[model samples]
Target: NPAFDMKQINALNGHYQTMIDNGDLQCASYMMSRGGEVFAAESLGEFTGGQKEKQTFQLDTIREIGSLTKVFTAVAVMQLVEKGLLDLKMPVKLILPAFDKPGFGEIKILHLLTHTAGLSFELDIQKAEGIDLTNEEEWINYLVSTPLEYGVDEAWNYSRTGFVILGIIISKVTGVSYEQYVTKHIIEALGLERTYFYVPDTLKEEVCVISEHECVQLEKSHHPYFPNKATSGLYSSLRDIWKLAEMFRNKGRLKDKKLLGRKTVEAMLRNQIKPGLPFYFFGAPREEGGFGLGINLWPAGDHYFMTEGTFSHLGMGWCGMFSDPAEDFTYVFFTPISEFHPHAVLTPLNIVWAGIEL
Candidate 1:
């Protein structure tokens, strides 16, 4: 655990300072392995700055985690897999029953996880002039009726609509709302009190909503933020999210309780997408990898060069988390600055990792 001492810490601190100086990043923080042991961790900066020169972003606060919500959706689906309430191989129609469209009727639950469901993003911007995220029945009905561009398990297309369907299925199967189920299963089990799908009225003032400009230029233009609570709505503090990372480091068991059966958790991390696209929802390619159930898997080696088996996800802009099981490291970086894409985060992160000689 002594992989890094004070001097190493100082060097790491300088690494982030350089990122801020170079304008490659506005605010950054991390916890990394030291001398082959964890429990060795450190973080730096306000992440979201509060000054114009510093961009005044609040990176440490909570914000909608975008599709990172899919990880929660995937975990819920796996719980069903553990209990036989769900079948990945079977067509989703068996549960939702309403997914029986021409091309989509054949889509399986696994297809949804793997992004191979041939399901296009159902939001026909032309037709969706004024849709609502809170109206679940309306959104679900519209998506189920929408036509598919391809067939299931054939090709990969990043589909948010597919996860929306998965969320609906989870809601229907558990007899509890999707939000409540996640709270009971993942959040409560991990004791992640700071991480939540919905910010309670009690905690709203303490959390910071992600900024829409200065990085992604989002404030100047329109970017779709999922108003729907089930699909994309999630908020958490890095301080709290690290516990989930610790859970993964602890291999899916929180204390004596197993949140998911070992086999079920393994299945979630294993490859669900193969022959996948280069950059569907993530960066161009630091190594070979593909999307798994709710998480992205970076293969060990590839023509493009990526972090092998490094799992990561990006929420609105570049606010998200990345974990390297091989290195036994987990990082949650939040940028209230707009459009802080992969390059900004990845560049500084790599610098720090390279500096990490433990």
Candidate 2:
């Protein structure tokens, strides 16, 4: 802990306050931890909404973590593999026999976790108005009938379809709802007290709302199919997700529980994306990076000062979670502003890195 400078910690908090005062962010919470021990926790600005009395954003406020949910989905898949219920190389059609289309048999479970399944980024048929996406079977039928964006493992493109298929596969194999499976295997297994697919009624008031401008509150959107739940509906707080980050840092073991085998955790952090292909993040070429099973591998970068094998991921809600095993450091940043901007996420990231002298 002595590796971090007190001056840098205060400077980081100062920068956070400056952003809120300048109207760059409405409310945000951040924390840094090492091997499950928290080094710094920061909460800034007010929780903007129809509050009779004002509420200040705190470490316990839950925010929809967007794509961070995919990491859990991927973890569930690995759990199935550990139980010998699923195989990474097994074709998806083997599980979802209803997907009897040509080339469907060639798409494997590994492709889904790595986002290299040749599935399109968007759904074509489901976009039509009045279509009920909430009906799981109907949506699966529509998805199976859709065409692949390219041949299997031909390239790398982020696909929500891949994860949806995974959720269905997890449901089919486990004989339970996708949410139930996640709650049991990953959430409960880790004892994540403040994480959920849906915030309970009692906790709804604690959910943060994403602002349009600095203070303009926007209505939350409902997915016809709960598309967000399977792909982006993970609502959690800094302390809760730190359990997950620490679990990975500990090589899949936490306290008395082992969520994944040591080898399985290694595979999750290993690069799975095809080499010599353009990998795009937010529509730009991300340099020296590739997709791990569920994480974005920072093989090398000045961006966050991460080592080659660091496991990281970003959320559409302007949030990010990163764990550096080499340094035994974990950093989490969350803010409820919908508009995608790098400044709000990056400046604080640099500060966290600067705070660590070693």
Colliding pairs, model 2: 133-225, 134-225
Cα miss at 311, model 2 (Å)?
1.0
Which one is best on TM-score?
2
What are the per-residue Cα lDDT tens digits for candidate 1 across 217-285?
Answer: 212122243323445666676655565555555557756657777676666777776664433432122
RMSD of each: 4.9, 2.9
List lDDT for all candidates, in order: 0.61, 0.77
Q: On residues 1-358, what C-alpha lDDT tens digit does candidate 2 reach at each position? A: 5477778888888887887888777887888886578878888888655433457788888887888898899899999999999999998888888766787777999988887777877676546455567667777777766777677877777877778888888988999988899999889889998898767777777778744331222234344354435677778888877888888888899889889988899989888876787664434455646678877776345545666577888877878888888878898888766576667876666767766665
TM-score of candidate 1 relative to the true fold: 0.80
What is the TM-score of each predicted model, taking all chains together? 0.80, 0.91
For residue 20, give model 2's deviation from the true position in Å: 1.0
**Residue 316: error of model 1 in Å?**
2.6
Model 2: lDDT to the true structure: 0.77
TM-score of 2: 0.91
